[PDB]
């Protein structure tokens, strides 16, 4: 009963899970990209958006913007 549709943010254990995802591949394919989406329960776009803020966060002169 209802719409099914909803939005998603990354939570702690979803970022350690995509951290992780990124150690092993920096760069996967949107199928791979697909497959972690559901198994971290986001979306292909929210888990693209991802992808792009690591990369933007990789590239930029900015410190401590990584938890460790």
């Given at each position: 009963?209802?719409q099914?549709?909803?939005?998603?943010?990354?939570?702690?254990?979803?970022?350690?899970?995509?951290?992780?995802?990124?150690?092993?591949?920096?760069?996967?394919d949107?199928?791979?990209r697909?497959?972690i989406?559901?198994?971290?329960?986001?979306?292909?776009?929210?888990?693209?958006?991802?992808?792009?803020?690591?990369?933007?966060?990789?590239?930029?002169?900015?410190?401590?913007?990584?938890?460790?």
């Amino acid at each position: 009963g209802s719409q099914r549709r909803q939005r998603t943010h990354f939570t702690s254990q979803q970022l350690q899970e995509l951290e992780a995802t990124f150690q092993r591949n920096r760069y996967p394919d949107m199928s791979t990209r697909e497959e972690i989406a559901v198994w971290t329960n986001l979306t292909e776009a929210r888990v693209r958006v991802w992808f792009k803020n690591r990369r933007a966060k990789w590239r930029k002169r900015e410190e401590f913007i990584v938890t460790d």
